[model samples]
Target chain A: VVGIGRDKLGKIFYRALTQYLTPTSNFSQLRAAAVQSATDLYGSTSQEVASVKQAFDAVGVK
Target chain B: VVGIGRDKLGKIFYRALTQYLTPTSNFSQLRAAAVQSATDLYGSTSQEVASVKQAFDAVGVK
Candidate 1:
């Protein structure tokens, strides 16, 4: 959660989704990006498992 | 969560909502029903106030 949350975001859409944005606005990507970005808070970051493990274990260097 | 979830449902609609459910198909009702069904999600009974008490308070001996 940021300074706001999904309910607040829902309020934003509820107040404006029907009237503010339209297909004519060319804003489909922008709208989808906003929703997806909000959900990314709970997803995994990209990293190879073995590489990540090796990086963590690289405490000694000869 | 059921065996199915919203994204899959969205796929179903994306493919067929427009094709299958027309304005004459009593679809406004169906659309409302479909979405609301998933959210009812452990709904409370009206008798909850008198018989159930506090809707979902635990440890009922009766």
Candidate 2:
């Protein structure tokens, strides 16, 4: 419940890379993008979005 | 830029405690509360919300 699975994680990152990330994106940018991508793929209130936030937070992206 | 200052951090936590937290609240609940509090005080897209997300992430709160 606290973390996302590998497949879902890859899906989120793939969406972030294709739809949100840019050539100059940094970790912080990646955080935002991943969150947004999660929000887009899942609803903003979904666990996936929350998991993305947690993942980025764990990585010290912000 | 990567972190929030003491004053803002205090304000966010205070709001979360007062407005969101309950006796049964856990770390994950606190994380949601803090993020919502920051969003309420500073817009959803504000740096405050992002910082709150980062702070909770740093503390290993999902």
Candidate 3:
């Protein structure tokens, strides 16, 4: 399940970005990736996906 | 030491993970793996060892 995959990837992403890429990875990207990561995890094929995506826009991931 | 069962000499070569892991556990597995989940380590002796590894952390172990 991507949900689990997302959890594992969190570590990888953190490592690559930790003191490496940028703590927040520019924030929105991180947020978007996180939401998408969750979306990929929950496998939620609903409008919430847009909300999740919008979360990035809210952060500036537009 | 596991990438191919490389837990080490007297050690073990374990290099893998899963999502189903939780307050769960197996005959010789763990309820948690955070103990030995470091990128460069897994000595997992941090009172957090059996706590995180055995996946028994939040589950409780001996």
Report the C-alpha lDDT of model 3 over A1-62, residue by residue, as the tens digit. 32222223333222222222322223333344435543554466744344434323322111
Tell me how many residue pairs clash in candidate 3.
Answer: 20
Cα lDDT tens digits, model 1, A6-51, are 1233222221223232332222322332244324422333222222
Q: Which ten residues in a row have the lowest lDDT in candidate 1 chain A?
A: A53-62
Model 3 C-alpha lDDT per residue in residues B1-62, reported as the tens digit of each score = 11212112101112212322222223233222233454224354443233233222222332
Interface RMSD of each: 21.6, 16.7, 15.5
Work out the TM-score per prediction. Answer: 0.23, 0.46, 0.25
Listed per candidate, the RMSD to the true structure in angstroms reads 18.8, 14.9, 14.8
- Against the correct fold, how does model 1 do in TM-score? 0.23
Q: Score the docking of each candidate (DockQ).
A: 0.03, 0.02, 0.03
Q: List residue ranges in candidate 2 displaced over 4 A.
A: A1-62
lDDT of 2 by residue, A1-62 (tens): 22354335545554554466554444465568768877887788788788766654433122
Model 3 residue B5 CA deviation in Å: 35
1 versus 2: better DockQ goes to: 1
Ranking by TM-score: 2, 3, 1
User: How many clashing pairs per prediction, in order?
Assistant: 0, 0, 20
Better of 2 and 3 by TM-score: 2
